[PDB]
């Protein structure tokens, strides 16, 4: 049993016609102190999977080390490591889920919420969640922490059910994700303006975008607000 110390907030994602998109800001909070700003919370595994992690940062770094090892280990005595026997998004997820559930079962969790995004070898999109309790689930859109409350509602207006996937383009999807990141920056006190975004396309491959910034913010209407009820000036 423990308590999280340095933490990462939301991780949001959704799937479109040809792949999946996942994003997360670059902040490492220490309680209410916005302590670290160069924190990458999207972990690429090979060229078909990206693991986004929220929660305790020390545990995130541990999970990072675990993932790099899975890659090394999978390459051992494996002449097809970069082909038919390369790590699949589903293998990576099952592994982490297994670990997450064993750790909670020993009353010593990895204090995180994880989303595994990727494209399988047969083209299928892969999007699944797992957290510190070992709980898992899939949906056309997935978000952790605050994003679950404010991002899913916006992302679900684009893909409300399975049949909406093929009708959704990378452009529409990325636009929706970027808008969601802005909304989170407006109402989540533990969020940052800078974030990373990754796209896993069954055709274009893996596109990892670093140092993005929330832009086109509306603040002007603030000049007209005065007092908290009766004040006029």
């Amino acid at each position: 049993t423990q308590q999280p110390i340095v933490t990462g907030t939301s991780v949001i994602s959704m799937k479109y016609d040809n792949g999946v998109i996942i994003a997360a800001d670059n902040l490492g909070s220490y309680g209410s102190l916005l302590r670290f700003n160069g924190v990458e919370r999207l972990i690429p595994v090979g060229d078909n999977t990206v693991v986004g992690i929220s929660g305790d940062i020390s545990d995130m770094q541990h999970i990072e080390r675990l993932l790099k090892d899975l890659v090394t280990e999978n390459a051992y005595d494996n002449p097809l490591a970069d082909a038919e026997e390369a790590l699949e998004p589903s293998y990576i997820f099952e592994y982490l889920a297994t670990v997450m559930y064993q750790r909670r079962s020993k009353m010593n969790p990895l204090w995180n919420a994880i989303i595994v995004a990727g494209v399988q070898s047969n083209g299928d999109q892969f999007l699944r969640y797992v957290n510190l309790l070992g709980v898992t689930y899939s949906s056309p859109t997935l978000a952790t922490g605050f994003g679950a409350h404010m991002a899913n509602p916006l992302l679900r207006k684009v893909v409300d059910r399975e049949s909406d996937i093929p009708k959704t383009t990378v452009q529409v999807a990325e636009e929706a994700i970027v808008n969601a990141m802005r909304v989170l920056y407006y109402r989540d006190a533990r969020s940052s303006r800078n974030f990373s975004l990754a796209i896993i396309d069954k055709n274009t491959g893996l596109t990892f975008k670093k140092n993005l910034q929330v832009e086109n913010m509306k603040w002007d209407f603030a000049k007209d607000i005065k007092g908290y009820g009766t004040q006029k000036i």
């Binding site: 209410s32 102190l33 916005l34 605050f146 109402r187 989540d188 006190a189 603030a222 908290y228 004040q231």
Partner: protein, 196 residues
């Protein structure tokens, strides 16, 4: 919350961020923390929003009645009324008020009433959760008798740092300038102060 008041050559300026939170959620990103209790007596509130609003509303009442009978009240008198309310009710209140006003005789003045209900007259004062991060910066850069432009810059730089490190602070930076010339309302947006 990040709030501060700074006396200078021509008077005094009050400044604040505009973020109010309930946990990690930002309940209001454009809050107005600069509260008018009299024409040229204003205050910055920190602590329980319910409490500080109730105190300010009562102080405004007391100062309106004071004015009707004895004329314009001194900033000191306004700070005294705030104090009386905060000290006598210290058990049921969580309020940290910065009082700042402009008098023609006394020019600009700043009084801080922290949690216990004690009062302190100062050249400048900072409060709120975000103030801890700018104690060093403010003590190294504050000078007495600065110009309006310099003071605005001092507050702008100070609060942008407070907002940078404190998750409970953010949004726009609001300022109120109190001089013989009148009352001026200033507002500064993120795209500006973030790149200082």
């Amino acid at each position: 919350t990040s709030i501060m008041a700074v006396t200078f050559k021509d008077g005094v300026i009050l400044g604040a961020d505009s973020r109010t939170t309930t946990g990690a959620y930002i309940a209001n990103r454009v809050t107005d923390k600069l509260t008018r209790v009299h024409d040229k007596i204003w205050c910055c509130r920190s602590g329980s929003a319910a409490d500080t609003q109730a105190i300010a509303d009562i102080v405004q009442y007391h100062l309106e009645l004071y004015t009707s009978q004895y004329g314009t009240p001194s900033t000191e008198t306004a700070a005294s009324v705030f104090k009386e309310l905060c000290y006598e009710n210290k058990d049921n209140l969580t309020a940290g008020i910065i009082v700042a006003g402009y008098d023609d005789k006394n020019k600009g003045e700043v009084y801080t009433i922290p949690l216990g209900g004690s009062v302190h007259k100062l050249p400048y004062a900072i409060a709120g959760s975000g103030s801890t991060f700018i104690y060093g910066y403010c003590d190294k850069n504050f000078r007495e008798n600065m110009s309006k432009e310099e003071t605005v810059d001092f507050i702008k730089h100070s609060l942008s740092q407070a907002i940078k490190w404190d998750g409970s602070s953010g949004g726009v930076i609001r300022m109120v300038v109190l001089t013989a010339a009148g009352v001026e309302r200033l507002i500064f947006y993120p795209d500006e102060y973030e790149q200082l």
